[PDB]
């Protein structure tokens, strides 16, 4: 019942290394509950356990040779972040107004206090227009 | 144990706006159980709760500039459907006998009585040949 | 709590029909637990129930007309394997050092003793370099 759960949705990114995305966490379809805390661009894990994690980033053109989404874990004890999931695609067509999604999801054993973020190769290529096209979520199984 | 669950699989579409797909719900790998009801092209949600939803649509050529899958919620109180998930891809190669899947899945808070459907940009491009290539499912977490 | 769960990660494939992949099951992010048994290239299902299954295979070039991932079930009673999930994509660009992921995941009713494997169209195109790019997992819901 009360398992930690969040579904986060894209917003226009404020200008700022694969940079980390920041998210909507309460409006429209986005939510956090049962001690899941969306804070400082991280999803903060409240309970040690196995979680299913997921993200889609829709990229659209307007130059890149490829586009990448990486979902990363930062742990308090470890200096280095751990890459959990990576979706990387070479981009074929020139121009353009191409567009395409990269979707990733898998199960990972996480510790209370772990922080999850989504990093992208190029923030300016991320389609931020709609909550249904770019999103990031996690739930305790 | 007895959580609402369905996995639905593609069938040849009967001719008929992003049109909605209709599905196999009992033969081969397809099923509905624990009060999940596949009715009138909708998955009907029997219990309020958080659900993981998912679909893949394999598109194949034989003209389009892009292909789109949208998973949509219709609620009794709301006039307008809500787009939960969208996978949209520009199509690069001309001709052709190209083919490619769009996969989407995420967690949403749903109300008893909600109805879920999958809409596509072009029904004629949907590969309906095999239950393992185009599918649509949901489970209460 | 103690539901069968595994997340398996890619390794360099030892040379050997869509051939089956073999996996890391204990180092880095990979694990098996609660009676899930990774044995002889199969995930062996210890308990009858509904499982969410998933895989991504990142393919990279260095000739193919297409790339395919299939997740397959072998049952003791049945002679023939059952294809549960298939992601197949035509490959457009010539050369090359193209790369791209195919991700698939869905829910299936499995019997104790069932064995799950991931088959690919071309083992030599599978990117085996990183545990976050090619992976295969399953959990009892």
Curated annotation (Swiss-Prot), chains A, B, C:
- According to the UniProt topology, which residue ranges lie Extracellular? 1-141
Which parts of the sequence belong to the THD domain?
4-141
Coiled coil regions, renumbered to chain: none
Localisation: Secreted
State the source organism's domain of life.
Eukaryota
* Residues the record marks as site: Important for binding TNFRSF6B: 77, 80
Q: Which residues are glycosylated?
A: 37, 119
Name the record gives this protein: Tumor necrosis factor ligand superfamily member 15, secreted form
Q: From the entire protein, which fragment is shown?
A: 92 to 251 of 251
């Amino acid at each position: 019942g009360d398992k930690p759960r969040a579904h986060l949705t894209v917003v226009r990114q404020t200008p700022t290394q694969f940079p980390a995305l920041h998210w909507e966490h309460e409006l429209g379809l986005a939510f956090t509950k049962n001690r899941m805390n969306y804070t400082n661009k991280f999803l903060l894990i409240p309970e040690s356990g196995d979680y299913f994690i997921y993200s889609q980033v829709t990229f659209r053109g307007m130059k890149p040779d490829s586009i990448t989404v990486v979902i990363t874990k930062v742990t308090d004890s470890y200096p280095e972040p751990t890459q959990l999931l990576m979706g990387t695609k070479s981009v074929s067509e020139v121009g353009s107004n191409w567009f395409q999604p990269i979707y990733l999801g898998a199960m990972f054993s996480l510790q209370e206090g772990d922080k999850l973020m989504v990093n992208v190769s190029d923030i300016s290529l991320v389609d931020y227009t709609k909550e249904d096209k770019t999103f990031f979520g996690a739930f305790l199984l």
